[PDB]
Amino acid sequence: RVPGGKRTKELGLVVPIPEEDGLTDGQIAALFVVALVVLIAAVDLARSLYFGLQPNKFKTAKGKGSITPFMKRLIENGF
């Protein structure tokens, strides 16, 4: 390095550099696989946020909707 700091030059502070890179190609690939999973989930989340709630679902969607018993208890308790 060509240090430009007065304190660095005075005290001889150094930026030690390893001989070998910390992570290997396989480790970087695994991290990238996890990042890809994150990206897919994030795209799905962005789509959901963009489209918001769909109150029409009760007209065509399968099932009859459900409220968890704890959610019902919270509703009964109130705010």
């Binding site: 009859k64 409220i67 019902k72 509703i75 009964e76 308790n77 109130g78």
Partner: protein, 216 residues
């Protein structure tokens, strides 16, 4: 009774005796990029020098004069200047792309500043300016963020609500619903259901009175 003039499209009327003698400039409407126009037609007793809203000056013909512009603002400014010169017969028209002519400025043949019969107030509010309802009071309603468009009845109702909700000590707290008693919509009379709801409300009030009187 008012008759709308022919006012041919400017692209069709290349040269007309009506057009006043004017210098010309780059401030005129862009013919390549716009099609909507505004025509102002008046009658002058004498040739008075006047300033075009688009750049230079002009001389109006003795008789009928017609000018073309892009904006009602330009037409109205020219009309104001003509009124200053005491030309009160000027009319303004909007010309669509297809040639339809809409008589605009003396909408009913009488200048707006002069009162005329058959005119009804539009966008008029029956109270002082500060009589408008609070914006936070009508939220998630028709007037979600426009408290200056609420009807007088809505304003009165919201005002009465804010007066009512000051008396905290005696306000009926809405009973908490029993989520257990939920049935499908498919699974009587409206009046009968209202009466049953009223019996339920009276029962709730009696229970509340007993519970509060237990320890007081």
């Amino acid at each position: 009774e008012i008759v709308v003039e022919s006012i041919p499209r400017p692209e069709d009327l290349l040269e007309s005796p009506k057009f006043p003698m004017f210098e010309g400039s780059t401030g005129g409407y862009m013919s390549r990029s716009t099609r909507e126009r505004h025509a102002i037609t008046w009658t002058a007793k004498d040739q008075n020098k006047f300033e075009m809203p688009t750049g230079g000056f002009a001389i109006m013909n003795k008789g009928e004069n017609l000018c073309y512009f892009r904006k009602k603002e330009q037409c109205i400014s020219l009309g104001k200047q003509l009124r200053k010169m005491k030309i009160e017969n000027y009319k303004i028209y909007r010309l669509k792309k297809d040639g339809t002519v809409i008589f605009m400025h003396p909408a009913d043949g009488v200048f707006p500043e002069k009162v005329n019969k058959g005119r009804v107030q539009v966008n008029g509010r029956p109270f002082t300016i500060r009589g408008n309802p609070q914006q936070s009071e009508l939220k998630w309603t028709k007037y979600h963020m426009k408290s200056y468009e609420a009807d007088p009845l809505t304003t009165l109702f919201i005002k009465a609500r804010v007066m009512a909700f000051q008396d905290i000590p005696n306000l009926f707290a809405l009973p908490q619903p029993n989520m257990e008693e939920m049935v499908p919509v498919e699974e009587y009379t409206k009046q009968e259901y209202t009466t049953r709801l009223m019996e339920a409300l009276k029962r709730v009030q009696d229970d509340r009175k007993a519970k509060e009187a237990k320890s007081l």
